[PDB]
Every structure is written in C-alpha cells, then in structure tokens.
Write a protein that binds this ligand. Structure first.
Ligand code: 006
Ligand code: 006
Ligand code: 006
Ligand code: 006
Lengths: 327, 326, 327, 326
C-alpha cells in the first residue's frame, strides 16, 4: 500500500521533506530521524538569529491547536534546542493526526548547524522511550487511529540532489527494492538498534549493537576501533578534525561486513566514500568517523542506507533490509 | 534492432567491441559518426603504439580477401597509414563483407592512440565522407537484406560507469521518451544539419551543426565562443583548450537549437563536468573553440547524452528525443 | 641579547621545537603555547597508544629528578592529558633551570591529536594563574635565578612552511622585525590577553579581549560574530565542520583591523587564507573559526602571528608588535 | 648590463614591456629564445583578437620607415600574418633601428592570442631562425657599439609576484651563484646543445636539447616519455597533454643532464606544480610529449627556474648556474 513523503538530498549529507502542521496546513521542511523521537518546528515565538530564516509555526492561526506550555531542552549530540510543548494536528504524507510537538523558541544552542540548514525542524522516527515526554512515535499514533494498514515505515535514499528519495508510511512498496527482505529483531526498543558481529576487513567485534539512523550523514564506530582500523591503509586524517581522506581506488579498502544469525550485510567502499577531486587521479573522503556510545555501538547512517532499503517495523520490533533499486 | 554495448571512459570517449574475420578476432572500437572509414591495427603495423593493441592477422580468417591499395586517413586529430583489405566484419551479431584499412603506421596519431583503449574506429558517416568510397556499413547491411532500415540509434549514457548503445536497423522504445523531431541533412557528407543557433544573446542564424559521437565535447567558432564566455565567470586555463567555472554559476545560460519544426536546448547541467566538490564545487566546461567552413558547430557527446539520436540514411534525416534518463 | 629555540613548522598548522629535561639531558619536541601554562612530557610510565611512538621521560636515569606524584588532569579544549607531577631541571634554549612538570601517563583523552603529531609534549608559556598548580612561568623562573637579563620572550613565525620559526627568551632581537614595537597592556595576567576594538570589514565589536596564542593554528571569533561575518562574501562552509572555503582572490574579502588607543593592527586576507586548489579557478581556506569564550573573546592565533613579530613581557604586562621581516 | 623586468603569469608564461617608436608606444612581450622574429599587432590588424591589445600606429612615430613586404610567421603553436616594417625599437633603455612584422591577421593563433596578456613576441634566437634573416636584436645592439657583449641572461622567478629578468650586454653577479659551466651549440639555429640525457634508467645518449624561454614546460619525444612514466605513479588526464601525480611521489627521479664538462639535474621539486593540497597534495607534472628531429628536448621554464641562463652569440655558447634562489 504505502504513503510517501519525497525527500530532497543535499550534498548526500542530509535529507529533508515537507510536512504540515495545524488545520490551516502551515508548511515545513523536516529531517526524518530514525535516531531521535520528538517532533519540533520553529515557533512564531522564536526570536533567535537561526529562526529568522525559517518557516515559523503560528499556534494562533490554527484553529485546532491546543495549549500545553511545558518547557523543554532537547539535547542531541549535534546541539540543543529549547521550547515548550504544544498539541496540534500534524499532517505527514497527506495522512492527518493530532500530535504533541515542540514550539522551539531558543535555537542558539544548535546553530550554525541550523542557520545553515534548509530544513525548519525535525521529525523523530524512533521508539517511544527515546522520546522526551513519553510521546508515541508518529507512525504508531497513525496506526492507533486506523489511518494506516500496518504501523511500518520505509526509507529509500538516493545519490544526489535532483535524484529523489522516499519515506513511505504504512506499506512496504516493491518499487524500492530487489531480492527479498532480511530482518533483524531489535535488542531494545530505543533506537532501531539491532544486533551484529561486525567485520571490518582485519578486525571484527563480537555482537555489536548497530543503530540504523536516517539522521546521520555518516557511518560511526567507537574511537578505539577506528584508530585500530585506519592504520596501514594510507588514509590521512586532516588534523584536529573528524576528517579522513584517501585516494578513491586505494585498493587496501576493505568491504565492510555486517553478519548476524539469519544474514550477511556488506558495504563496498564505493559506498562509504565521497568524491572530492577527480582529475585523472580521484581523491575521496572516507565516510566513517569516531563516536563513542554505550556498548560497542556503531551507527550505520546514510552511507549504509544508500545501499540498503530499510523497513522499520513497530509491529514486530524488526528492521528489514534489501538491496535498494538503482532505478 | 540490435545494439553494440557501449563502454564509457571518463565520459570523454566511448568504445564498443566488434568482430572482424571468420576466425572472429574481437576488437575495441570508437563509433564515429564523424568519419566513414573502418580500420584496425594490422598484425604488420610495426609502430610501438601498436604493441598493447588487438591486431588483425590476415592469416587466421579463411574469408580474408586480399586487396593491398595503400591509403592515408587524415583526421584533424591525426593521420594513419596502411593499405586496404577485405573480410567478414561482424557488429553485434551482424556479419557482412566489407572493405577496410589495415593500419601499419600509427605514428602520426599518438600520444592520442597509445593512451586510448581502443584499437580502431568505425565510420558511421556517409559514402561522400569515405576515403575509398566504401559504402557506409549500415547501407551495406541494408542492401544485403540483413536489417529492416538503413538507420541507427545513438543512446549514450549520461554518467561514467553505465552502458551505452549503438542500435542498428530500427529505433527502439526503451532508449527514448516523448516524441521524436527530425531535421534533414544540408549535405550527405557529415550528419550535418541546418540550425538557428541561439546561445544567450548570440545567435548565429542558419548554422551548420554536425552530429558526431566521436567528439567528446561541443564546439564552437573560436571567435563566437571567446566572445560568449566574456562576462560569465568562466576562466580559461592558459594555452589549453579548457575552461573552469563553478557549477552553481548562475551567469550560465541554457543553449538553444531551434529549427522550422522544433527547438532543442542544452542546460548547463549537460555541458559541465565535475573536477572538485568540497564546499565549493568546480566544473570544467565542455565547450571548446574550433573553426571550420560555415558557422559550423560540432554537437558531440555532451549533446548526445541529453538527446537520443537516430541516424537515417533512408530518409536523409537526423532525429532526436530526450534520452531515457535511465 | 636573547637565546632562541628554533621552531619547525608543519603545514603552517603547528610549530615545534626541542628542549631538554633531566641532568642527563633527555630530548623532546614541544609545542610552545602562549595560551596555556603547564609543561608536560610523556612518561616512561605511559602505556596508552598515543605514547608509543614518542620520547618518554625516564625519571630514573636523571640524577636530579625529585618525586612529587600528585596526580593531574590537564584539560585543554582540544582534549585531556593525565599523569602526575615531577620536579626536574628543564633546559630550554640552552638555559638550565629547575621545574615542576607533568609526567603524562594517560593520553587516550588527546589522541588522535596526539597519535598524529610529531611532538612529545607541550610547553606552557602563559601566566601563572592559568597554571594547574600555581607554577611560575618558565621565563619568569629563568629570571628568578639570574639566567636572563629581562623576563621577556618573543615569537617569530615564518611565512610558508620552510624557512624556520624561533622562540627567543630574555632578549628582543632586531634580526626578527622592522619598524618599531607598539605595545599593549594586558587586561588580566592570565592569557596574553590585551584589549581591542576589532573591525572586520562591515561588523565591529567594542572593546574585545584578544588572546595572543602561539598554540592555535587559526584566528577564532565568537560564533554569533562569525555567522554575522561570512554572510554575503560567498564563503561556503563545509557541512558539519569548522571549515570555510572560498576563492583565493574573492575580492569581497575584508582586511581585518584591530584597533586600540595607541595603535592600529591589520590583517590582509593573504594572511588568513590557505590554498587547496590551484587550477585556473583557485581555492582557499579561510583560517577563521567560530569559538565561544568568556567576553567577546577572540584568539589571534597563528595567522596573525605570521604578519606580526610578538614580544611577551612579564615585567610590564604587555605584548608588543612589529612587522615580522620576510627575511 | 641592463634588464627588462619580467612579469609572471601562473608560471606558465612570462612577459615584459619594451617600446617601439620615437613616440615610444610601450608593449607587452614574450621573450622567446625559441624564435627569432619580433612582432606587434599593427593598428591595421583587423581581427577581433586584436581588440584588447596594444597597437603600433605607424603614424605616431616619426622614425617609422616604411617597408611593406608581406609575411607568414608559422610557429608550431600557430601562425600570424602581416607585412614588414621598420622603426626604433627600445629594450629597457636600449634604442635601435630594427625591422619587424606588423601583425594584421592573428586568427590562426587564437584562442592562444586572445587570452594571452601579451601583445607580441620578441625572438631571442639566431639569424638562421629568422623569417627574413633579421639579425638577432642583441647582435644588432652589439654592432651599433651599444653594448659590451652580444650576450643575454635569463633570470626566472618561482612565485607569482617575484619578477623576472632578461638582462642584455653582460652577465650579472646578483642573478646567480657558484660557477658557470658552458656548452656549445650544435647549430646556430635554436640555442640547441648536445646532451647526454639521463632520466631514471632511460638515457638517450647525445641528444639535442633546446633552451627556450617561450615554452612553459619541458618536453621530450612522445615515445621515450610514455615509456618513462610507466610504473611511476603518474596518471595522464584523457586526451589532454597533462599528467597528475602526488607531490611526495617517491618513485619520481631527479633528471640528469651531463655533457663532457658537466652535469645538470632536475629535481622533482622543479618540474611539479601544485594542483591540490589538502590532506593529500597533488601536483601536475611539467613534462610533455612532443616529437622532433633528433632526440630533441625542449628545456623550457621549469629548467630555467632552477638554472640562471646565459646566452652567448659571441662565444657560440649557452651557459648555466644555480639561479640565486632569491
Ligand atoms: C533522543 C536523545 C535524547 C536524549 C539524549 C540524546 C543524546 C538523544 O539522542 C539524540 C541524537 O543526538 N541523535 C542522533 C543519533 C546519535 C546519537 C548519539 C550520537 C551520535 C548520533 C540522531 O539520530 C541524528 O542523526 N541527528 C540528531 S540531530 C541531526 C538530525 C542533525 C542528526 C545528526 O546529528 N547528524 C550529524 C551526525 C551525527 C553523527 C555523526 C555524524 C554526523 C554528521 C551529521 O550527520
Ligand atoms: C576532414 C576529412 C576530410 C575527408 C575525409 C576525412 C576522413 C576527414 O576527416 C574527418 C575527421 O577528422 N573527423 C573527426 C570529426 C571532426 C569533424 C570536423 C572538425 C573536427 C573534427 C572525427 O570524426 C572524430 O570525431 N574523431 C577523429 S578520431 C576520434 C574518434 C578521436 C575523434 C576525435 O577527434 N575526438 C576528439 C575531438 C575532436 C574535436 C574536438 C574535440 C575532441 C576531443 C576528442 O574526443
Ligand atoms: C591549560 C588550561 C587550563 C585551564 C583552563 C583552560 C581553558 C586551559 O586551556 C585550554 C586550551 O585549549 N588552550 C588552548 C587555547 C584555547 C583557549 C580557549 C579556547 C580554545 C583554545 C591552547 O592555547 C592551545 O592553543 N592549544 C591547546 S593544545 C594545542 C597546543 C595543540 C593548542 C590547540 O588546541 N590548538 C587547536 C586549536 C585551538 C583553538 C582554535 C583552533 C585550533 C586548531 C588547533 O591548533
Ligand atoms: C620561429 C620559427 C620560424 C620558422 C620555423 C619555426 C619552426 C619556428 O619556430 C616555431 C616555434 O613554435 N618555436 C617554439 C618552440 C618550439 C619548437 C619546436 C616544437 C614546439 C615548440 C617557440 O620557441 C615557443 O616556445 N613559442 C612560440 S609562440 C609562444 C611564445 C607561445 C611559444 C609557445 O609555443 N609556447 C607554448 C608551448 C610550446 C611547446 C610546448 C608547450 C607549450 C605551452 C606554451 O608555453
């Protein structure tokens, strides 16, 4: 079946698509993040520098807005936003549903990541307990009022700007993938964390939790593991920055291997590399960066999701994977 | 129809393999609607440029029919040397007697040749354009009741590591979309057409425009061009026929090709090539200064990436559509 | 008069010189940082990855070492080092003097900034009260025992990479500059913070504290001030990093103007730019980055110090400036 | 001596100004020890490449002595057209009657000409090289008891500002250091010299090697070179005479140039130019395939940047030192 917000892609490094808010259907661009669980927009109320270029929600000219007013920090690792809670009717796709969200009023905690973004707010797409305010996930809310067949959603991401990407709600559309799905059951309903013995060419790590995260531009690994990784594969790290450079055909670059009970998952380097220079010799950025999180915890972010169509299934506690169609 | 699977190389030249000989020696070929002769490095080609190449040995094929006349191939991008021969040429699964040049002296055509990953060229041009009046391979195939139409299609892939097609005998549905305007040759020489050539301000009315798959690039009059880029933000890198600009450059116009029937247009997204993308992103521009007879334009590869091309010996036309973008 | 450690320069991006520790004169490379105030070396004792290629100080085979052993974090904004205090006699230039320093034993908090460097430790060259342990500044220490004429030091940093930099202790040598010195009284003896109305093309900020900092590769500005700056001068910021790219002759680039009661100090853009691409069009990195610190606080780091010879004067509480010679 | 201050442009070509006429029209010039004719865009040059250029108006100078014979300049990098003339040329503060080409048709020499920021070239080659046998400008100055020596020096800067020097009349101390080996011309044609040419393994004994300030680069036979770079890590960018490598590339040798007296050598640090430096540093390499008579090599700008050059009509010699590095 399925209902689909098409997602525009900027420098392969973030994705955004429209959604509406209020019964006067005020428009907004959002990052759909399977690694966070709240929704927010700039508030008509906000007076910080960053807000001033964005589309500002007016709680006023929506007739279906209801007041709440409880104040909230929202602390991503990328920065902080702050506002208060409101209730209104959010439309995603053209599915409509009441929701609790944040009218953000302070953003200085999140700029320039925000002053230089082309998105008004974020839409959380993880699980209920990653939420600030125990708010049900929007796909879940939709199910809970017969708006959707199944409380499942999918990500299809592509390979640059006027190539179009697609978040689909409540249906698993064949148009996106090839082969069959392979599923992995989650190990907490928090992030879409599943459970994996990872193998990066030379070192492996036993049963790691892998976060599948639409929100991250990059693949991440804990920092011990990475230094352990890059040594000897002629990758030069620009100094003082999470930034790794190598020749595009550096033939010492291992295919990454994600392996589970059911299945095997792989990432050729053509997937975790960015072309940066291409003039007889081609130079590349390696799209893997240090990040320390609870367990052995790796985020497969955007590079992984480019190879793999992904089905997130609230009903079963699973994420499915198939090869994404190139066309 | 029937297509030869085209190989991309830096989007700067494409090649395909085609067999010569009953013994069926396979070769790497550039298919060049800009010339009308076929050739290969003879096994008796003694020039070191020849040494990595695929040779044709007139021994191995039974069908080898001796000729021997000597011959000069004078491409503006260099010259080759040898003598004529005959044998059974095959293109995809299309076999036929043809006369061609056995190439023995590759020296006046390197470095060009010694780098290139191609052994010879095939002319997809006209009988008029041939050195030796060899009938174009398609027109032969026709008058041997071997395919429906003295026609071919050029489907070139927009992008580097993807396939590309020389279809023969009939237009295919897959390859294109929308309709298919035609225009007619103003000479049965090159696949040259008569064209109202608009380009920002600068028109140059009733130009001759050569369609040509051999050319990696688009060309213009050295004077009309130099005058064009002026005031845009396109820097020219000194004594090389090369120009860099930023890819977002908003001074950059679309290019117009209107006729009596219709209009065609080249978006800057079709005549730029990336070189560098990191924060700012620069692209090199695929239009180059080269002078000939009229206002004579070469629409090369950048144009054919946009427009599927049909080459019609029968109806004296060339015809175009939006290349199926994939 | 003066004595001088000659400083080697890597990618215009950090500078290091040799010095000795112990009475068996064990050698080490150090960053001389006028923006922190402690000395440390890797300890013979250190077993973290980042130590493993460095020259480790053996408290043992110095016959003049005295134990202390009190343990210390040292928390730069670039990272953390950890170890304990020892006393030994440190020689810089070839001036010899007793000191309290840090035997660093844990570095995992500072790597790869330390795994990818070619320097063993750091030498703090700031003021007493920036020191962990109220330790007198080395140059001060040296005065306090008749090793030097006057408790003053100088930084001469070279243009481009080769050609050699120098720190000069206890003498102002005419070989390094031209014109005359213009001095500025400090506004706390903490950093070499002086007091400045800064003027960058279009935006000015009234009476800013400027930190003169040999250690920093770049110029820094508070984040609001920067976003406010770069707008409209076609400077693209690489996404998700403190990285600013532009065309080298972007003729919108303002000369920076630092202006005080006595004096005017200036920085043409040929000083705050790093090339990156020279093919016809020509690309440049802008060596200014957002950094938020107490007041309106700017660090004039390595770019400034390339135009300007600098005299740090403990005796007067001043920093003096003259044009560095090009030869 | 007496020097003309040379201007640098992308280290790809240098230029200087020198005056022609009694009225003293100043001009931008390339000083090319690779040709021996002087020329300027006549005020009667009607070609649109002429329009930003500095023209010579044979009206303004009294001293204009009419000639008019028509003439073709056929550089290998293009051709120019005009008729001859005569007047008082000045080079720095050196004035003298000289016969030259008034250039009227620059079309066979663009885009080259219309971008270049230079109006004419001056030849600093020999009489035998001259089209019309005009005696070289230095040998004239000489034989008008106007300077001590039919000699000149070429001093060449490294960076973009930093300026260059064509000195005339005598070698200067400032410009160089150490000694000064000489070698003797194997023809009084180009300043060509006989050289045992060593380069990694590949020698090519007793080659002829042209010193030439006009050339931006160093050149070699297309075959010897192609074979050279093989197994280096030097990628060639497709059908442009252009090669990229990483600047630290350790497979890159120093070049050798030995004779009977002495040996000269080109460090990679002299024949590379940064294209890209960030994390990895890439450099484009200044050596290019071009074929002539013997093993004939053009030592151009990369070589003259290392070595100061002394050009000796009198003692038939060319001589070199380490260019005073500043
Ligand atoms: C929900 C919650 C509640 C309380 C506390 C915490 C810590 C919580 O988690 C939040 C979180 O930070 N969530 C992150 C996921 C996350 C968690 C922990 C560490 C790192 C990431 C969210 O999914 C996400 O992608 N994001 C978030 S913002 C973003 C959309 C820009 C994106 C991101 O950072 N994108 C940037 C990013 C992220 C990682 C690496 C590289 C890059 C570049 C760019 O791609
Ligand atoms: C003139 C003539 C008269 C009677 C008979 C004959 C056979 C004649 O020769 C026609 C001719 O030479 N034809 C050329 C085409 C041509 C026609 C008119 C003017 C100039 C060229 C031949 O077809 C062809 O494309 N080529 C040739 S080789 C090639 C496949 C590499 C390609 C080419 O140059 N490719 C290169 C090229 C060419 C031009 C611009 C850019 C680039 C980049 C590169 O990819
Ligand atoms: C010692 C101390 C004790 C108590 C409290 C404080 C705040 C202390 O000082 C912290 C500090 O980090 N001090 C920094 C200075 C500083 C002060 C405030 C904020 C940030 C830095 C020390 O001077 C220093 O240069 N450094 C430090 S490491 C280094 C010498 C390589 C250099 C640096 O990082 N350089 C990196 C840097 C720093 C800023 C901008 C760009 C870059 C690129 C790179 O060069
Ligand atoms: C004068 C004369 C009279 C009768 C006969 C002959 C054969 C004559 O000489 C021809 C000649 O061209 N002479 C050339 C040298 C030459 C000789 C043989 C083959 C090729 C060149 C003259 O010196 C010269 O450099 N030049 C000349 S124009 C120029 C100043 C741009 C420069 C040049 O080409 N510059 C370009 C160039 C040249 C070679 C390689 C790379 C580049 C890049 C660019 O910098």
């Amino acid at each position: 079946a399925g209902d689909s917000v098409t997602l525009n892609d900027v420098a392969n490094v973030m994705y955004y698509g429209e959604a509406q808010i209020g019964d006067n259907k005020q428009k907004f661009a959002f990052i759909f993040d399977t690694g966070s669980a709240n929704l927010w927009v700039p508030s008509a109320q906000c007076n910080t520098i960053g807000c001033k270029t964005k589309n500002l929600y007016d709680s006023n000219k929506s007739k279906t807005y209801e007041k709440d007013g409880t104040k909230v920090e929202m602390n991503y690792v990328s920065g902080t936003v702050s506002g208060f809670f409101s209730k209104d009717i959010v439309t995603i796709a053209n599915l409509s549903f009441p929701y609790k969200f944040i009218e953000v009023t302070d953003t200085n905690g999140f700029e320039p990541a925000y002053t230089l973004g082309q998105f008004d707010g974020i839409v959380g797409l993880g699980w209920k307990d990653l939420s600030i305010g125990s708010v049900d996930p929007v796909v879940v809310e939709l199910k809970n009022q017969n708006k959707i067949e199944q409380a499942v959603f999918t990500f299809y991401l592509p390979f640059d700007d006027k190539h179009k990407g697609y978040l689909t709600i409540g249906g698993i559309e064949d148009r996106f993938y090839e082969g069959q799905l392979t599923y992995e059951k989650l190990n907490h309903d928090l992030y879409w964390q599943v459970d994996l013995d990872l193998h990066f060419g030379n070192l492996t790590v036993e049963k790691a939790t892998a976060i599948v995260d639409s929100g991250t531009s990059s693949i991440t690994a804990p920092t011990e593991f990475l230094n352990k990784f890059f040594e000897g594969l002629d990758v030069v790290k620009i100094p003082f920055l999470p930034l790794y450079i190598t020749t595009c055909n550096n033939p010492k670059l291992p295919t990454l291997e994600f392996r589970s009970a059911t299945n095997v998952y792989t990432l050729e380097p053509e997937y975790y590399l960015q072309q940066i220079f291409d003039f007889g010799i081609s130079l590349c950025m390696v799209s893997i960066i240090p990040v320390d999180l609870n367990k052995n915890t790796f985020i497969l972010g955007d590079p992984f999701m480019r190879k793999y169509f992904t089905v997130f299934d609230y009903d079963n506690h699973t994420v499915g994977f198939a090869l994404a169609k190139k066309k």
